[PDB]
Amino acid sequence: FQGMTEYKLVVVGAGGVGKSALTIQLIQNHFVDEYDPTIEDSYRKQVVIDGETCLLDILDTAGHEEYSAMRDQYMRTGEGFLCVFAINNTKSFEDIHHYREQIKRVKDSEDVPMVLVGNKCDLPSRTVDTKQAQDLARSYGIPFIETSAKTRQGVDDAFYTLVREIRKHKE
Ligand SMILES: Nc1nc2c(ncn2[C@@H]2O[C@H](COP(=O)(O)OP(=O)(O)NP(=O)(O)O)[C@@H](O)[C@H]2O)c(=O)[nH]1
Ligand SMILES: CCCN1CCN(C(=O)c2c[nH]cn2)C[C@H](Cc2ccc(-c3ccccc3)cc2)C1=O
Ligand SMILES: [Mg+2]
């Protein structure tokens, strides 16, 4: 034993779905009301999951980005991916297929650890039903979790679930 296990997590999805708000709620216990578009930012947190101490290295990505060799390079180093849409934005849900294809291409694999995240569950303007998102996740063989970065519903669960998926794949 030379130190805690490290997990490299990448958060992807369309512009404005709440990738940064989810990550800042996890790290700082703070809700960000402002919309400041991301290029690329990285965070670390030590947590205990299923009795194992580990270090989460989290990469928060841009939601609007043309083809970039530099974006492919950091995605290749990711071990697992949170694929985020907003439950009030149907286009962000339709964009999930494109994120999943991008990940499979860069990792050269059909079997990459991933969790589908439906964020902004606190808002009254739902356009994507729970059953539709659950059906999509079942079709991919991955978990689905509903979150709110404002209330904190599901935030720890999304990240911890992704770690559990990475552990299953290693074993
Ligand atoms: N009501 C509510 N608002 C949210 C939630 N998550 C994010 N928001 C709001 O949505 C806006 C965009 O959030 P942000 O985290 O910056 O989105 P992003 O996916 O990181 N955008 P980008 O891809 O440009 O970096 C902000 O005004 C933020 O407060 C949520 O769960 N509920
Ligand atoms: C230290 C400077 C570089 N950073 C920036 C921020 N860090 C800091 O501690 C910090 C504190 N003050 C300012 N920065 C933690 C961060 C650790 C980290 C996160 C993510 C990844 C990753 C995940 C997926 C794919 C590829 C890579 C790999 C590593 C990091 O190493
Ligand atoms: Mg962001």
Author numbering: -2 to 168
What did the original publication write about this model?
The RAS family of oncogenic proteins is important as therapy targets because of the frequency of activating mutations in almost all major cancers. All family members function by signal transduction to the nucleus of cells via interaction with effectors (such as RAF, RALGDS, and PI3K) that catalyze phosphorylation of downstream proteins. When KRAS is bound to GDP, the protein is in the inactive state and becomes activated by nucleotide exchange from GDP to GTP.
We determined the RAS-binding sites of PPIN-1 and PPIN-2 by soaking KRAS169Q61H crystals. Crystals of KRAS soaked with PPIN-1 diffracted to 1.63 Å. Weaker electron density was observed around the linker and tail groups, suggesting that the rest of the compound remains flexible when bound to the protein. We have screened a chemical library that yielded two RAS-binding compounds (the PPINs) and have shown, by crystallography, that they bind to pocket I near to the effector binding sites. However, when these were tested in an orthogonal NMR waterLOGSY binding assay, their binding to KRAS166G12V was not impaired by the presence of the anti-RAS intracellular antibody fragment, nor did they interfere with PPI using a cell-based BRET assay.
